[PDB]
C-alpha cells in the first residue's frame, strides 16, 4: 500500500512513464540532464546561470558537460540516462531508491552489455533492494484481455515477436529485430537532408522525431503508393522550423515506416516485421498456431503509424495457409500498455520471487540479468 510497491519505470525513446505498482496509470509521463558549462559561461540574455536543466541544456549539449539518451529503444548515452533516472525518483515520484524494488523496461533484442549496465547502475549507483528488467512487448501482452496470442512489440531500440501460450512467453520462438523507432527517425533525417535540407542544430535533430511521428504513414502498396506520390496534389505536407523556415515532405512520409517491412531500405539484411511474426508462429506448437494467427496484437510507439494494422494484415494474410482467420489487434492505447502491464506484474505476490536481489547481484555480479530475466 503505496509505500511499498515497486516503481515501474518505462524507458521510451520519446517518452518515459513512471509510477507505482498496483496503479492504473503512470504518475509521471515526461519527455526523454543538468548541464554545467565546464568553461565559465552565460549568454547575455540570462543571469550567470551555469547549470542549464532539461531541454535548454539539450540545445547547448554540444557546448556543455551534462550530468544524469535512448535511441538501443537502446541507450546510447549512459550518464544522461543516469540523470533521467535520478530525476524520476528524486524529482518526479519523490521517492527513495533504497526502499523500493524497480521494474525497468527494456527494448526487445536489447544488447547484452546494456542489460548489465542498467543492472550495474541500478544496484551500485541507486542501491536498489531489487530489480527486474522486462522486454516492453511482453508487458503489453500481460496487460491485455487475452492470454494466448503473439505480440509484436516495437519500441525505440528493439522489436520482438513473442508467442504466448496461456500467459507464458515461448522463449524458443521469440525473435528480436534491431530496428525500431530510432532507426526510423534516423532514416527520415537522411532522406530529408538528401533533399538538401539542413538539420544542423541539436534541438532540431530532435525535430525529425516530430515530423516522423506527425506525418508518417504506412502504405498498403508501397509500389502503387510511390506513383501516388508522383500524382501529387495532396501528399506533400509542411513542417515549420523553430527557425521560422519551412519543410515540405512528400514520398518520404510513407518511405520512412517502410523500412520496417523492407529493412533493405536501411541497408540491413533482416526480414521485415511481417515475416518475423510469421517465423515465430512457425516455431511454436502445432496446436496453438491457429490461436496465434487469430490474436496478433501490436504494441509499442513504432506501431502507431496509420496503415500498420491493415498492412500487417495484408502481409500476414499472404504468407499464412489459405484458410487461417487472421485477426491483427491494434488497440488504440497501444498508448500506456507497456507501463500497466508492468504495474500488474510487479504487484502480484508472484513477482517477488522473480527479482534479482541486492544479495544476488553481489553473489554474481551484473551478468545475472541474463539468467534471471528469461
Amino acid at each position: 500500500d503505496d509505500d511499498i510497491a515497486a516503481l515501474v519505470v518505462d524507458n521510451g525513446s520519446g517518452m518515459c512513464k513512471a509510477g507505482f505498482a498496483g496503479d492504473d496509470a503512470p504518475r509521471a509521463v515526461f519527455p526523454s540532464i543538468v548541464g554545467r558549462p565546464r568553461h565559465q559561461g552565460v549568454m547575455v540574455g540570462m543571469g550567470q546561470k551555469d547549470s542549464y536543466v532539461g531541454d535548454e541544456a539539450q540545445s547547448k549539449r554540444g557546448i556543455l558537460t551534462l550530468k544524469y539518451p535512448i535511441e538501443h529503444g537502446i541507450v546510447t548515452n549512459w550518464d544522461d540516462m543516469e540523470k533521467i533516472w535520478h530525476h524520476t525518483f528524486y524529482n518526479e515520484l519523490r521517492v527513495a531508491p533504497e526502499e523500493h524494488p524497480v521494474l525497468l523496461t527494456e527494448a526487445p533484442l536489447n544488447p547484452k552489455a546494456n542489460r548489465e549496465k542498467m543492472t550495474q547502475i541500478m544496484f551500485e549507483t541507486f542501491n536498489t533492494p531489487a530489480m527486474y528488467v522486462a522486454i516492453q512487448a511482453v508487458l503489453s501482452l500481460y496487460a491485455s484481455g487475452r492470454t494466448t496470442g503473439i505480440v509484436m512489440d516495437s519500441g525505440d531500440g528493439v522489436t520482438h515477436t513473442v508467442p504466448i501460450y496461456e500467459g507464458y512467453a515461448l522463449p524458443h520462438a521469440i525473435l528480436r529485430l534491431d530496428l525500431a523507432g530510432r532507426d526510423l527517425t534516423d532514416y527520415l533525417m537522411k532522406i530529408l537532408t538528401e533533399r538538401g535540407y539542413s538539420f544542423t542544430t541539436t534541438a532540431e535533430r530532435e525535430i525529425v522525431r516530430d515530423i516522423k511521428e506527425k506525418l508518417c504513414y504506412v502504405a498498403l502498396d508501397f509500389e502503387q503508393e510511390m506513383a501516388t506520390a508522383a500524382s501529387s496534389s495532396s501528399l506533400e505536407k509542411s513542417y515549420e522550423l523553430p527557425d521560422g523556415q519551412v519543410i515540405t515532405i512528400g514520398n518520404e512520409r510513407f518511405r520512412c515506416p517502410e523500412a520496417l517491412f523492407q529493412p533493405s531500405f536501411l541497408g540491413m539484411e533482416s526480414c521485415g516485421i511481417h515475416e518475423t511474426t510469421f517465423n515465430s508462429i512457425m516455431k511454436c506448437d502445432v496446436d496453438i498456431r491457429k490461436d496465434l494467427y487469430a490474436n496478433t496484437v501490436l504494441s509499442g510507439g513504432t506501431t502507431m503509424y496509420p496503415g500498420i494494422a491493415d498492412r500487417m494484415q495484408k502481409e500476414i494474410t499472404a504468407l499464412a495457409p489459405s484458410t487461417m482467420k487472421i485477426k491483427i489487434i491494434a488497440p488504440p492505447e497501444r498508448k500506456y500498455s507497456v507501463w500497466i502491464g508492468g504495474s500488474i506484474l510487479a504487484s502480484l505476490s508472484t513477482f517477488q520471487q522473480m527479482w534479482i536481489s541486492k544479495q544476488e547481484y553481489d553473489e554474481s555480479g551484473p551478468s545475472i540479468v541474463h539468467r534471471k530475466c528469461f
Binding site: 500500500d1 496487460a143 504487484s347
Partner: protein
C-alpha cells in the same frame, strides 16, 4: 439440461456456506469472476486462511485473486484440469461449474 441444474444446485451449495461469512452470490457465472467470494468460500469450508486479496477491479487483479484460490485448491492435492484463472475471470460457465464441483468434491466429499 445438466448445466442449468448444476448451476442451481452448486449456487445453493455455495450460498449455504457463504452465508456464514454474511454474503451470498446470485449468478454463479458472474459472482466468482473477481475471485473474492471464491476465496471467501474456500476459507469458510476449510477453516484456513488464504493469502490476502489484491485490491483493485482490473482484469489482472481478478486473475491474481482467482489464482490465489486456484493455487490453494491445487495445494490440497487437487489437479485443476485445464482450469485456468483466465476462464474464471472471463465468466466461462463450463469451467466455473467444473471448478466448483472440484471444490465440492475435495472439501465436502
Amino acid at each position: 439440461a445438466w448445466e442449468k441444474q448444476q448451476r442451481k444446485t452448486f449456487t445453493a451449495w455455495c450460498n449455504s456456506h457463504l452465508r456464514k461469512a454474511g454474503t451470498q452470490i446470485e449468478n454463479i457465472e458472474e459472482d466468482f469472476r473477481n475471485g473474492l467470494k471464491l476465496m471467501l468460500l474456500l476459507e469458510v469450508i476449510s477453516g484456513e486462511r488464504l493469502p490476502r486479496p489484491d485490491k483493485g477491479k482490473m482484469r489482472f487483479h481478478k486473475i491474481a485473486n482467482v489464482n490465489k484460490a486456484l493455487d490453494f485448491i491445487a495445494s490440497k492435492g487437487v489437479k485443476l484440469v485445464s482450469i485456468g484463472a483466465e476462464e474464471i475471470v472471463d465468466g466461462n460457465l463450463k469451467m466455473t461449474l467444473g471448478m466448483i464441483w472440484t471444490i465440492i468434491l475435495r472439501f465436502a466429499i
